[PDB]
Amino acid sequence: MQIFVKTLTGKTITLEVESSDTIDNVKSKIQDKEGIPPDQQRLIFAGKQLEDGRTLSDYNIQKESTLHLVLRLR
C-alpha cells in the first residue's frame, strides 16, 4: 500500500510499502529521497517507537498510516 511519514517541520512524505516490509526497509526508502542515515532515524507509530527487525504486520499498520520521524543524537 501507500503510507505517510510526517516530519517535525510540518512536512509529510509519501512512501510506498507493503504490509510485510521490514522497518529498516522503510528507513532506507526515506534516505532514498531525504538522504538521512537509517541509523539516525526514529520511526514512531501511534506514540510508539518501532524496531528495525520487525515488520509492518507486527504493528498492524494499514494504508494512509502516519508515522513520525525523529532524529537521534549520540
Partner: protein
C-alpha cells in the same frame, strides 16, 4: 605605538586612499581620528543611544573580559553538530572564555552560522517552529525522546552565551517570551501571542465573553506528540474540575504559564545553565528583551549605503567599471540575495547594530573588502577570514552578475 613625527615631517601615499581607524579595544572602526575632536551623532535613536550605553557597560566587566590564551575547536563541516557537541562539552567554561580558534577538519563566525542551522533543526526534536509559516523557534516539549537532550540544551545554551561573549551572532529567531525568560522576567498573556497564536486567540476570547453555556473546559491541557494526545492537569485533580466564569481568570493564568514556562521547565533549565556559565545572570538583566535580541541575533537588514560606504578595495577604485557594476548588481538584488552574498564573503548573514563600520573579522574588526584577483574566466572567490572577495576584472556587466550569482549559489 610609535610617537609623533619629528616637527616638519609629513606622511603621504603612493596611491589615492582614505584612512580610517580601528579600535581593537572596543572592536570598532571609524573615520574620525581619536586624536581629533569628534562631535556626537545627531538624530540618533534614543533606544540605540541607551543600548549603545548599556553594551559599553556590559562588555567592560570582570566576567566579560577575555582570558589571554586561545581555545581551539576542530570540527568537520559535514558533521558540525556532533563534532561541536564534543569539542564544546569537553572544555570547561573558563577555557571557553579565552579567545576562540575554530578550524574545520577535512580541507583545512561562519562556524556559529552553520551551528545555529543545526542546533535549531526541528528534526532533532530540541526546538520547534511556531505554527507553520513564521519560523520563529521555541523549545520542543517532546525533547524527551532523546535521553541526551538535557546535555544538548546545556550545550545550546553554551553556544548562545559563547556567541554573545565573543561578538558572534546567532542566526535564529526566538519567540518573544524566550527573551524575557532569559532575563528571568515575568511572562503574561501578551507573550502568548508570539509563542502560540491559536491559544492566544482562544484564551483572549474567554476573558471578553461569557463561557458558562458555550464552553465545557476543565483545568487541564492536552499536548499531542507523535500523533498521540497527552493531557496534563493545571492543578491537582484539574481534569475533573469544571471551568466557569467564576474561575475562568484562574484558568487563563494557569494555562499561559503552563504552555510557556512550566511546559518546558526542565529543558529551559538545562539551557539556561549553559548560557549562564558564560553570561552571568546578574549582568544580563541590564538589557530588556528587545536589546537582548539584538545582542544575540543582531541585524539582518542589509543597507546598501552603509555597506558601500564602509568597503575597502585591494587593487580597485570605487569608480572602476567592475565596482560600479558590482554595486548596481547589489542594489537590484533583494534582502535575501544580499544576505546570501554576505554569507558567501563573511560566513554569516548578520550585521552589527552600529553598521558595516564595525563588521567583525576573525582577528577583530574587518571591513568588507573587494580584491582585484582572478582571471575573467574564473568565478569570484572569497576569504571569509578577512571579509574579502576575490573579484576578477570582468569586462562586461552580464558576465559579472552571472559569475557572481553562481559563486554564491555554489557555496549555498
Amino acid at each position: 605605538q610609535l610617537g609623533p613625527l619629528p616637527s616638519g615631517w609629513e606622511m603621504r601615499l603612493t596611491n589615492t586612499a582614505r584612512v580610517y581607524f580601528v579600535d581593537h579595544n572596543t572592536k570598532t572602526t571609524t573615520w574620525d581620528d581619536p586624536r581629533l575632536p569628534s562631535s556626537l551623532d545627531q538624530n540618533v535613536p534614543q533606544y540605540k543611544r541607551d543600548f549603545r550605553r548599556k553594551v559599553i557597560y556590559f562588555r567592560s566587566q570582570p566576567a566579560l573580559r577575555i582570558l589571554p590564551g586561545q581555545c581551539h575547536i576542530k570540527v568537520r563541516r559535514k558533521n558540525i553538530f556532533e563534532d561541536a557537541y564534543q569539542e564544546i562539552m569537553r572544555q570547561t567554561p573558563e577555557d571557553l572564555k579565552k579567545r576562540l580558534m575554530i578550524k574545520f577538519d577535512g580541507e583545512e563566525r561562519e562556524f556559529f552560522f552553520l551551528l545555529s542551522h543545526e542546533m535549531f533543526n526541528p528534526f532533532y526534536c530540541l526546538f520547534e517552529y511556531s505554527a507553520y509559516d513564521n519560523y520563529t523557534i521555541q523549545i520542543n516539549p517532546n525533547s524527551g525522546i532523546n535521553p541526551e537532550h538535557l546535555n544538548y540544551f546545556k550545550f545550546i545554551g553554551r553556544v548562545v552565551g559563547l556567541g554573545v561573549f565573543h561578538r558572534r551572532f546567532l542566526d535564529a529567531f526566538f519567540v518573544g517570551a524566550l527573551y524575557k525568560m532569559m532575563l528571568r522576567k515575568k511572562v503574561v498573556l501578551q507573550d502568548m501571542e508570539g509563542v502560540d497564536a491559536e491559544v492566544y486567540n482562544s484564551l483572549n476570547w474567554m476573558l471578553e465573553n461569557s463561557i458558562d453555556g458555550v464552553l465545557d473546559l476543565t483545568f487541564s491541557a492536552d499536548d499531542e506528540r507523535f500523533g498521540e494526545v497527552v493531557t496534563v492537569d493545571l492543578k491537582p485533580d484539574g481534569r475533573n474540575i469544571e471551568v466557569t466564569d467564576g474561575n475562568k481568570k484562574e484558568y487563563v493564568e494557569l494555562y499561559t504559564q503552563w504552555r510557556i514556562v512550566d511546559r518546558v521547565q526542565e529543558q529551559f533549565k538545562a539551557f539556561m545553565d549553559g548560557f549562564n556559565e558564560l553570561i552571568p545572570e546578574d549582568l544580563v538583566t541590564v538589557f530588556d528583551e528587545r536589546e537582548l535580541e539584538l545582542l544575540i541575533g543582531g541585524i539582518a537588514e542589509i543597507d546598501i549605503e552603509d555597506w558601500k560606504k564602509h568597503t575597502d578595495y585591494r587593487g580597485y577604485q570605487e569608480s572602476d567599471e567592475v565596482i560600479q557594476w558590482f554595486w548596481k548588481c547589489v542594489s537590484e538584488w533583494d534582502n535575501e540575495q544580499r544576505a546570501r552574498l554576505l554569507q558567501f564573503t563573511t560566513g554569516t548573514s548578520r550585521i552589527p547594530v552600529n553598521g558595516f563600520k564595525d563588521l567583525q573579522g576573525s582577528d577583530g574588526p574587518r571591513r568588507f573588502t573587494i580584491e582585484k584577483a582572478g582571471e575573467v574566466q574564473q568565478l569570484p572567490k572569497s576569504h571569509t577570514c578577512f571579509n574579502r572577495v576575490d573579484l576578477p576584472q570582468y569586462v562586461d556587466y552580464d558576465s559579472m552578475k552571472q559569475k557572481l550569482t553562481l559563486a554564491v549559489e555554489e557555496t549555498i
